């Protein structure tokens, strides 16, 4: 089977101010070959995290993500590229792409929607026809 990146789901609904972890899975047969693995997460035109030769390149990460966005590295040997972003903001809503090279290469898109703090209380404020 061709090299395929999978997503557990393609839409995350997250609360403003929470921490979110979004995931892309890739095939790893036995032990992970870190020399081979390249991971890049992007949203809009912003570098969220790139990972190559076993390390994150934080000098290329967009400044809005400093101290906020990382890969859960220990998940990579399980074939899981798990991006955690702390203290989610309204402007974190949008379309994210995970790009993975591990011999073969593929990518997926994930949408994030962010609920503001009073969204639940106001859900039934005023419905319309």
């Amino acid at each position: 089977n061709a090299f395929t990146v999978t997503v557990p789901k393609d839409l995350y609904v997250v609360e403003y101010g929470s921490n979110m972890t979004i995931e892309c899975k890739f095939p790893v047969e036995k032990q992970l070959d870190l020399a081979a693995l390249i991971v890049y997460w992007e949203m809009e035109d912003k570098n969220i995290i790139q990972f190559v030769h076993g390390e994150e390149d934080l000098k290329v990460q967009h400044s809005s993500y400093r101290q906020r966005a990382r890969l859960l590295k220990d998940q990579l040997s399980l074939g899981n590229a798990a991006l955690q972003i702390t203290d989610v903001k309204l402007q974190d809503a949008g379309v994210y792409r995970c790009m993975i090279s591990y011999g073969g290469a593929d990518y997926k898109r994930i949408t994030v929607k962010v609920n503001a703090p009073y969204a639940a209380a106001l859900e039934h404020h005023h419905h319309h026809h």
């Binding site: 890049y40 992007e42 035109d45 190559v52």
Partner: peptide, 14 residues
């Protein structure tokens, strides 16, 4: 994103 041809065509940064 700046790595030669890696992911060329898939990203917007740069």
């Amino acid at each position: 994103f700046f790595x030669g041809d890696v992911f060329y065509g898939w990203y917007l940064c740069g």
